[PDB]
Design a binder for this molecule. Sequence first.
Ligand SMILES: Nc1ncnc2c1ncn2[C@@H]1O[C@H](COP(=O)(O)OP(=O)(O)OP(=O)(O)O)[C@@H](O)[C@H]1O
Ligand SMILES: Nc1ncnc2c1ncn2[C@@H]1O[C@H](COP(=O)(O)OP(=O)(O)OP(=O)(O)O)[C@@H](O)[C@H]1O
Ligand SMILES: Nc1ncnc2c1ncn2[C@@H]1O[C@H](COP(=O)(O)OP(=O)(O)OP(=O)(O)O)[C@@H](O)[C@H]1O
Ligand SMILES: Nc1ncnc2c1ncn2[C@@H]1O[C@H](COP(=O)(O)OP(=O)(O)OP(=O)(O)O)[C@@H](O)[C@H]1O
Ligand SMILES: Nc1ncnc2c1ncn2[C@@H]1O[C@H](COP(=O)(O)OP(=O)(O)OP(=O)(O)O)[C@@H](O)[C@H]1O
Ligand SMILES: Nc1ncnc2c1ncn2[C@@H]1O[C@H](COP(=O)(O)OP(=O)(O)OP(=O)(O)O)[C@@H](O)[C@H]1O
Ligand SMILES: [Mg+2]
Ligand SMILES: [Mg+2]
Ligand SMILES: [Mg+2]
Ligand SMILES: [Mg+2]
Ligand SMILES: [Mg+2]
Ligand SMILES: [Mg+2]
Ligand SMILES: [Mg+2]
Ligand SMILES: [Mg+2]
Ligand SMILES: [Mg+2]
Ligand SMILES: [Mg+2]
Lengths: 491, 488, 485
Amino acid sequence: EHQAIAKMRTMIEGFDDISHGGLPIGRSTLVSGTSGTGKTLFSIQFLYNGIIEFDEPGVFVTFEETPQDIIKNARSFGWDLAKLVDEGKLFILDASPDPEGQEVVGGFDLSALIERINYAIQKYRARRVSIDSVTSVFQQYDASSVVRRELFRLVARLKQIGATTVMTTERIEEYGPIARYGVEEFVSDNVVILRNVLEGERRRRTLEILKLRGTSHMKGEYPFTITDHGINIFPLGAMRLTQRSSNVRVSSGVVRLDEMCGGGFFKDSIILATGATGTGKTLLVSRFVENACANKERAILFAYEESRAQLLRNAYSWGMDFEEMERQNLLKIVCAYPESAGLEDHLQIIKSEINDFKPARIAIDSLSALARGVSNNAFRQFVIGVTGYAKQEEITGLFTNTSDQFMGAHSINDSHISTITDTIILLQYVEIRGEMSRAINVFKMRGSWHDKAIREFMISDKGPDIKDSFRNFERIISGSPTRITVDEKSE
Amino acid sequence: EHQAIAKMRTMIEGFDDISHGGLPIGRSTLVSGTSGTGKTLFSIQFLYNGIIEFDEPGVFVTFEETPQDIIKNARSFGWDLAKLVDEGKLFILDASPDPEGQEVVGGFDLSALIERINYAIQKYRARRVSIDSVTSVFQQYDASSVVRRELFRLVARLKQIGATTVMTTERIEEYGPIARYGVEEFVSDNVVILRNVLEGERRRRTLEILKLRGTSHMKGEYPFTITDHGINIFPLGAMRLTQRSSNVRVSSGVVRLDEMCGGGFFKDSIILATGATGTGKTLLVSRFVENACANKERAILFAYEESRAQLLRNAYSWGMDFEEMERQNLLKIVCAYPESAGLEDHLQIIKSEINDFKPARIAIDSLSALARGVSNNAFRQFVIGVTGYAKQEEITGLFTNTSDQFMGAHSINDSHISTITDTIILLQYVEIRGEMSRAINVFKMRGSWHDKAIREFMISDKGPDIKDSFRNFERIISGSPTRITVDE
Amino acid sequence: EHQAIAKMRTMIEGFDDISHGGLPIGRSTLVSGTSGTGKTLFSIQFLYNGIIEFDEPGVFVTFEETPQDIIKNARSFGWDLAKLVDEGKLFILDASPDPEGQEVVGGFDLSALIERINYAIQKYRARRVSIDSVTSVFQQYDASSVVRRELFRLVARLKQIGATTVMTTERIEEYGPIARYGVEEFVSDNVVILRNVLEGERRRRTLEILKLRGTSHMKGEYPFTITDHGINIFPLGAMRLTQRSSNVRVSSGVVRLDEMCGGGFFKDSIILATGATGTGKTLLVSRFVENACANKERAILFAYEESRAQLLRNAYSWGMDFEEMERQNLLKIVCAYPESAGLEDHLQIIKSEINDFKPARIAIDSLSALARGVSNNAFRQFVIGVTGYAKQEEITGLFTNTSDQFMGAHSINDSHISTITDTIILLQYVEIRGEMSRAINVFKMRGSWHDKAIREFMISDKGPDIKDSFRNFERIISGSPTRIT
Ligand SMILES: Nc1ncnc2c1ncn2[C@@H]1O[C@H](COP(=O)(O)OP(=O)(O)OP(=O)(O)O)[C@@H](O)[C@H]1O
Ligand SMILES: Nc1ncnc2c1ncn2[C@@H]1O[C@H](COP(=O)(O)OP(=O)(O)OP(=O)(O)O)[C@@H](O)[C@H]1O
Ligand SMILES: Nc1ncnc2c1ncn2[C@@H]1O[C@H](COP(=O)(O)OP(=O)(O)OP(=O)(O)O)[C@@H](O)[C@H]1O
Ligand SMILES: Nc1ncnc2c1ncn2[C@@H]1O[C@H](COP(=O)(O)OP(=O)(O)OP(=O)(O)O)[C@@H](O)[C@H]1O
Ligand SMILES: Nc1ncnc2c1ncn2[C@@H]1O[C@H](COP(=O)(O)OP(=O)(O)OP(=O)(O)O)[C@@H](O)[C@H]1O
Ligand SMILES: Nc1ncnc2c1ncn2[C@@H]1O[C@H](COP(=O)(O)OP(=O)(O)OP(=O)(O)O)[C@@H](O)[C@H]1O
Ligand SMILES: [Mg+2]
Ligand SMILES: [Mg+2]
Ligand SMILES: [Mg+2]
Ligand SMILES: [Mg+2]
Ligand SMILES: [Mg+2]
Ligand SMILES: [Mg+2]
Ligand SMILES: [Mg+2]
Ligand SMILES: [Mg+2]
Ligand SMILES: [Mg+2]
Ligand SMILES: [Mg+2]
């Protein structure tokens, strides 16, 4: 073949993105990690997808987990392997030493199994194979130099055979050896490592394609999740800056605010509402979510602080009976503490839920509520995933944030999200004549014009009331004014 | 079979939550940890609850712990394991060594053993099996490869007998290798990790469902404790956000306050009293609890800075009679330094103290006192756990809090409980003509209206009173207001 | 028995509360540690107390140290181990190798020794046993496996004879495994790790009860102090928020100042005196320390910054004389560099000195001098130690602190010692018309009225004099006043 290397899509969401095509055909790939990174699965689901998507008969070589169970478990994702076993579209080739036997059977069986393996490829006319825990095969009695030669025997053959392989391997250090013997490493053409790194009690899964000989791939670890629908990696690094941009408008929910933005927000932008605690934000969100239920166009509300009944009561006080909203299925409300899942499972449920209610708007009440306990970056990386999907996805977005410090909050945001939104509305407390009076102002809008005036506003059983600006004050922004009361021009 | 993997219910508080159902039935679940982590308990509590909440007889294997003691120790949790074996719903398959050395019996292992076990199982209808410290068996002279096959031949047979097992291991490095030989992680079907991390000078026990082959489970490490009633895990990440929230209102205890709050505190919410030291907090607490008792409802005051005595005094000086509330069975003053337990243990002392008195009011004097010493990240999870529980039990709670800075305190909290609370009160000092004056202020009140004004707050013998506001000042929050006068 | 575990007291200062009761009866406890931690001192102290308190004899197996050696060191605490051996109350079993040369003698090992131990137990009707340095025993040629067996043999045998035991082990890394081979860790019913953390050229020994089978014990480590009285532990968490309270009051030494506090300091109260350097804290203490002698009461004043001579000095030119106090025995000045004792000691140095002279009042001149080279937490504890003691012991304790910054200290304490203290006084600077004027005021008092004003006081020959406030001035706190006309 005088042409470049040929790859093969695994149909594993996000993987074929990282691999600029996917596992190279004809060559064997090595995927390893510690006890639980998803390996077993990464192979199984590597085969399944093949069957169901191109009917490329798979051959699953075990070594420890009994064949019987490899199925019993695989039904957790809705994969009735039993079937593909009947329909000869996949052959589970048992190779796990029974409860008894003898010893000193070194390379003895390795030269045979390769005769057995070629049998299922030959017979079932296979194309994709996946040996799981090849490691427990050397877990008999062998040195490092002993491992490099038993493997190279297999891959060798399989490359002649032409089959495309995947090998499972165990590791004990998350960022250390690449496999117990640190030898398989240079016995593969491609090495992929799966990591389930701990951290402050939080578990984060990731995947990295260390090497793929003769081609390009995505360098670095990528957060993946294991769910009811198999390994799902999120190439938050992939996704291009190919976002749609319409000039159309939508109503903020406050006619007097819709003005201040030159006519509203854009059907293709991210709106950030920031302020100290109790500035309005939650109200905003609500008057944003509601304005969507108005024009009978479903939308979602993601509240991570308040709850089911607490958001009804509190909103109902401002008017807007959310009740009829859920009924006329033009608004559904999620809710759940951020501590209920890592930003990996969250980012997901976001998109996942968006794919069943088909939004038009979307409001995340408190962004700083997610950020909680998570690392700086691990968070920015979360905005992007959200701000990104909900932009190339026609979804308008409203993100609420709390500047951990009032009257003096020398910055819209604190996490540095400021530079990834299209509109910056900020609510702040102003101390006028010994009283905490609010003040909303449109800080920025890349598209439209928007008002540049700082205006106070009061909350009421009526909702937001954007009143007059502080036409006669100074240092207003700080929060601690100093009225002018200038003696005119002295007559 | 075509179904998913059905899990048995351990019956350990919260474990099931973490495991999502329980131990994969008919399968071998693992449980290793450094010594003193709990294991043996967990693997024993495994049976007892089963054999007494479902009735499934159990055969507890033991490699080192003698049967007498395995029974002697269990009397630590009030469990009579003697009985269970006096009825055939439990069997101590004593596999402990004998003080007579004797080489050659190392082979009889597994194979000859396995039969013993099963022989027992059969003689009891054993549904659950807890083999403790299987690791001390190959503590004769075995390799890493050797053990793998030794195990592969131990789980297998037990997997066959269609019985659910509990394998207990041990390790050394707290985070390092999961189980001694780095073989039990990849060889097992279920792996549980019992850690007893030092982290400072205190120790925080924690459990982790590392991996359950075939199903889902709570990823991560979760806090837990061992008490007379056994293991007690608190999955402060699996508590739903379905907090019953009504529109009722209880009275704060202070009249002028309730007005400023649009008419009082919602019986279903969490109040946060924050402010420089000396401002007032503890008072608002004492006046909070006074009320619960005036309406003859119960209330608990978890004190973390003063003794029951110094606390009763402070009250008399303010008018209310805590001395009474103690007998009129309408007040529980707990008292205990924050250093007397890891938050892990306190959350429970509280959780327990509540459902031992069903109070309508819970006061936590000085949340800061608890946070001193601990991380800010471990603090937030404690507040959340109490902020949450407190709610779910329709209980109104008042949490104190001292801001490490007096005056010019721009951020409510330096900690940032700020957003996880429903009602925020704010006391602060203000100089006015060479004199420190107190100043109350309702900051946010989610459900209702509430008064903006920042009024002067006077403390005296007759309790706390609210005077007028600093209506003619600029930068009153700055700690040093400039007096202006505008009149035609 | 159909009950819980039976525990035996050790009387080892504070251990019985950390272990909740004592060491589990008829069972062996392993006490490990790196060299110089205190193990033997723990082992001996046990048997020792077993005798002098409960007339309970004990067997002490010594694998390495010589018998006459054990006896000798023991004297460092004033314990006549020779005598207790002569009264047949304790037996030092000597399993120490011969200074000569022999490889074929201990061929019947363990089993052969056990009979001895098991003999002695009965010959001496001993109730307690402590085996010092088992490690050194098989430290010959053994694996992680050859130990677990040998030991378990001994342990079980000692369990059968119903002997409550103590096995001592060595370690290498401080927070590394619990014992040399990683097996005693589990053949033992109970685990005790003695540490010796050396953080910052300073050493701090602490004890932890890893595990006690079927019972309760405080988790984590507590710091201890080997002293002439042997092991002494302080579980600054095993203390209770249960101290006697009151309304009775006491003078401050400064009349005026007492009025601003509702009429004196409470008695059961801890007073904090913060303020920039040079604000007179030292002048309040002395005055406070002195007022206790006039009324005729015993008060202590621990120093950490000024000597004894400089103290008596400045205290003279300020009027009241400290000398007289000492003579009369109505006062006692300590003195000692913070650096010359590890807090936990100090804490104790104070406790004893307290138990010595029995004080009504105490003056800790500068907590924020002890705070030096110590961690926020390590110190936050030292405080709770003394603060919570003076209370349960009903003492009038006035402490001193220094705000690291002058005029404008946007806070009271940097280590937030407040909220633990009852009454906070506050001396600060004020720049008025090119001058450095002083300011004093009560920032909080828990059970009284106290003046809410910021007064200016003048220091001079007679002492501290408090005057009136800065009415017509703004920003008095930021240090830079703004006389507004
Ligand atoms: N339906 C599911 N939903 C969510 N998570 C699941 C589901 N099924 C399995 N998991 C998770 O994925 C893991 C499965 O890993 P798997 O058994 O496939 O192989 P491995 O971890 O790579 O290697 P090995 O388990 O043999 O050591 C489980 O440990 C669990 O955390
Ligand atoms: N019925 C009402 N009448 C008058 N004011 C109300 C009413 N309900 C709520 N408010 C006001 O609205 C604020 C509630 O906070 P809000 O709903 O704006 O959420 P937020 O500022 O976004 O977030 P956070 O929960 O952190 O404060 C209160 O501070 C209060 O002053
Ligand atoms: N009634 C009880 N209340 C509180 N804690 C207890 C009680 N009983 C025992 N404990 C604690 O639990 C621990 C007991 O652990 P356990 O002996 O059951 O198993 P393990 O430490 O996991 O493994 P192993 O002891 O076999 O090495 C002790 O360290 C002790 O502190
Ligand atoms: N009988 C009383 N009469 C007048 N004022 C009192 C009386 N008792 C207490 N006070 C005042 O109340 C305050 C006592 O502290 P308080 O009960 O308010 O708790 P806090 O300020 O929240 O916390 P902390 O006590 O730890 O400083 C003091 O500032 C004091 O001036
Ligand atoms: N009278 C004493 N006063 C203060 N410290 C003492 C006194 N006597 C001994 N010490 C200290 O106590 C320690 C004694 O340790 P000990 O002999 O008890 O056993 P160990 O250190 O646990 O084990 P090993 O000595 O066998 O290595 C010494 O390191 C020393 O610093
Ligand atoms: N005899 C004196 N006459 C007048 N003023 C004095 C006299 N002695 C000291 N002072 C004043 O008191 C201050 C001394 O402070 P003092 O010795 O009381 O302790 P401190 O300021 O609390 O702590 P530190 O000495 O560690 O700074 C000096 O700054 C000075 O202005
Ligand atoms: Mg696997
Ligand atoms: Mg909110
Ligand atoms: Mg145990
Ligand atoms: Mg065990
Ligand atoms: Mg306070
Ligand atoms: Mg207080
Ligand atoms: Mg909010
Ligand atoms: Mg010694
Ligand atoms: Mg000083
Ligand atoms: Mg001084």
